[PDB]
Design a protein around this nucleic acid. Sequence first.
RNA 1: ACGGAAACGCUUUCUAGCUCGCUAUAAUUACC
Lengths: 345, 123, 124, 220, 220
Amino acid sequence: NDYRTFKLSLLTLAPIHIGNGEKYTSREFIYENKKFYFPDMGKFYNKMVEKRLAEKFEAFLIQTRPNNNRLISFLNDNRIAERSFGGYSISETGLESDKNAINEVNKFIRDAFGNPYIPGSSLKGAIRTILMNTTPKWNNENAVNRFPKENKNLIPWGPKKGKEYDDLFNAIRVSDSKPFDNKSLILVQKWDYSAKTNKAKPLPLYRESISPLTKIEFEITTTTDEAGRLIEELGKRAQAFYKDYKAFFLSEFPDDKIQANLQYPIYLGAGSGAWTKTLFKQADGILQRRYSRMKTKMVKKGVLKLTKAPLKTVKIPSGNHSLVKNHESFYEMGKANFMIKEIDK
Amino acid sequence: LTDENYVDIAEKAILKLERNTRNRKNPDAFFLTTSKLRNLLSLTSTLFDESKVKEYDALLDRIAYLRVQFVYQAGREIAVKDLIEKAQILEALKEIKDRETLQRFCRYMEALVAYFKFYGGKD
Amino acid sequence: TILTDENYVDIAEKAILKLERNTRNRKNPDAFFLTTSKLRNLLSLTSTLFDESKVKEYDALLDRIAYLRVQFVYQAGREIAVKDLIEKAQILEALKEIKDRETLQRFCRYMEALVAYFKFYGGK
Amino acid sequence: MTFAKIKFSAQIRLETGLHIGGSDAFAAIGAIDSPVIKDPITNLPIIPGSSLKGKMRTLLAKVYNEKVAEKPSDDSDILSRLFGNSKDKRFKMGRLIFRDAFLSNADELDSLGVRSYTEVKFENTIDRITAEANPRQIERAIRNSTFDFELIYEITDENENQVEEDFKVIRDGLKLLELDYLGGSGSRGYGKVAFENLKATTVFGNYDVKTLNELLTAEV
Amino acid sequence: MTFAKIKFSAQIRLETGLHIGGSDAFAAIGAIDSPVIKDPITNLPIIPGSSLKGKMRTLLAKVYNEKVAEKPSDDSDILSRLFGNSKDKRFKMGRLIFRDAFLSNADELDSLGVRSYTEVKFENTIDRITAEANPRQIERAIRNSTFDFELIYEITDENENQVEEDFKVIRDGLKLLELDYLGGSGSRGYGKVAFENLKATTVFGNYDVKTLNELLTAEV
RNA sequence: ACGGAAACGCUUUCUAGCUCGCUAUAAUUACC
């Protein structure tokens, strides 16, 4: 009973994509019927050995010197009727459009077994930027000695010789998620809304992400008083961070695009943009300065990040609470909300 | 083929490997990065580790998977395909009849990587 | 040619003297870039080689002399002070020259000598 | 109570990825991660008894000392009695023997279609001023792995009350480890583990384990 | 009643890494390690018979004395009978001869592709206030190593029933070693050991072992 | 019809006890 334990439930209000490093290529899958086809490249190989097709499959795969047709076309060029090798396919939403198209997709982070999950490391990241952005003690500093960077002694965290082990963030433990059924994955696309253009022009990038209105559970343990009475107010602080981030950023873009806030907000993992992953207050001048001279960070602030997803919008608070406000199927990427609890003992 | 004097072969391959000569300090300047290889090296090592308490006859699924990811990755990045050429890896794979042959190949990979890092490869 | 019975230790000492030292340290003397921790897994293999050169015959341990070379270059790849050592001390050449249990044992001892004089003249 | 040995056995199931030990000796050539402690012969992950003893002891000090306990020499007689104390004549030799735990269910996992018995997790850190990301890879023993667990308890000169209290301390210890992690990157959700089929057996001498088995299955 | 010599043979399998060792100033010039005791010619790990005898004896004192003995001179006649007592005229020469055990399965291991017969185990300690970590490397003989085990028992002047009792004590001793460790960092999981293929053979004189072989295949 | 016969340099003794390889770190930023 000596620690404190909290149980935090995450409802995704938009496609969430944290993801690992790997990415599927246009040669490793097939758009066929409602669902996308994601094989096991292994099982493919060994059924194509069993079909005497192997040498073709290799010369096809090794044939990437920027292969301009490289797809499940190669299947159809051969007999290609078989199709029982590999597991879990993703269903065609119609969004992330132009199909028949997708050249490249970013894999969601999947565990040992092939199921995906939300690593507590990533959630803790986001909890951190919430906790950081609120607390006035830490919202004022970076290091200048030498292009600027985070102070990184702002929160003491290491063992110090002869001192009584002060490390606060060691006392906040964020559970790895369970793995969830791979049948909730979606393939959301990136659209950037620039209020300079006041139009929203879709970019060539696809992210396998969690379909909205998913529940995913976490446990968070605290071994110190300060951490107890920190994670206690994660609700307050969450809604406060969203207050500042709207006031700073969202509240200068068409209210169509701003998603409505349902429980408590969090920006988690995606291409949800720079201000979600910083102390945006102190980051402002410096971050911009980072993108001078290339594909520019053009607006004085950023572009706002949007994604085409099926309007699920089913949540019932005595009517249609339809998640997104707008009519062009536009969620704000990596937007989710949560509710936190306290258990006992 | 390759066996038992294969370190000299591995080296002879690696010094031949592709170079980004444009760089202001482009010494040999390998185009390749351990990052690109990683997955198939974890695979090759897991294969060696596995062949000790299992039998050459019954492993060959995993050797298909190895060849597969070799080709896939050969497609996905140019310097990998280049490596697989200049070190004749794909020729070597098909040549594995014994557990003796297989273990030889695993060792070969080890050697290639060692001499890569030695000669200024970036991990 | 490189490694003679009269030769090895005097060479090893010379190599440890010619080795890259950290002159950028105002506080430190001649202080070595190199550090025993970097060599540990390497010279463990050297010692297992010597230890087995007694209980087995030369051909039986060819596999071992293979894996030694590899590890050497690998570590020389991963650490700068290692590459410096195995450079100044002609290590890889010294392996190439081992036809013989006499030659092999001499190399193992050579490593021993290098390490001794490393620790002696300032160590990890 | 005349001499006897009670063997606590269980299976440790990893509820999350676990990362303990290792060095650039056990390393694979071109591994870029922080590797894990492994059994040298099978190259499989192993859970070192040193780790289990360590963690269980330091957690139990928070419960059972009611004292500062600057060094382990300074722990209470009840903990020193069990884990041993180098600076006390009475407790120089401890009544508990932890054992390196080894992976049981390799075949279960091979069936579940794993391509290795260790996962390499990619993580990063994002600078909060510059937004720059610095990535890192680290090896973990895969989730839902099981390890055969053994702990040996020795009844010698500790007559009636003391064995009971010791049993209590062992159960408290294991539960505390279940409500904590096995040393890894724990704050970021590693090393959550559970003791399955926890069961007592008298493997030497004569003792009644019915009561203990009841108390283990339910109350831990 | 007559004279005869029985050879107890087994193969000791290391269930975990074993550390005996301790020649520090005679160590390999290599690197930091707490070295393990090695046969000088082959530089392989050895299990010194002194170790086996010592540990088995002090284990057996806990069972068979039924009064705590300050010195090994004060052990019971049953233990003195077997292990020797320098200060008792009757037992000055003990009926047991333990033998240095040597690595049997070097070939098995060379086949399994092992590149050393000893691992270096990396451990640390955490300061309980400062949380500072102090690391520590210590050598073990690798886990699935096996050693040829030999113990010699001498029948002269003993009631065949005395021989029976002696056999009981020997079997209890070996089992107790199995439920304990061979001296190392034992509390932290070292020195777990198993006797495989345990059998008796009369190599001098005449004695009937059939019943004993049955009984010690039963009790291990 | 050897300053020589006869005489094990032996019996007892665990290289042991105590010690988490641990400590912050969203796989991410930018889209004229």
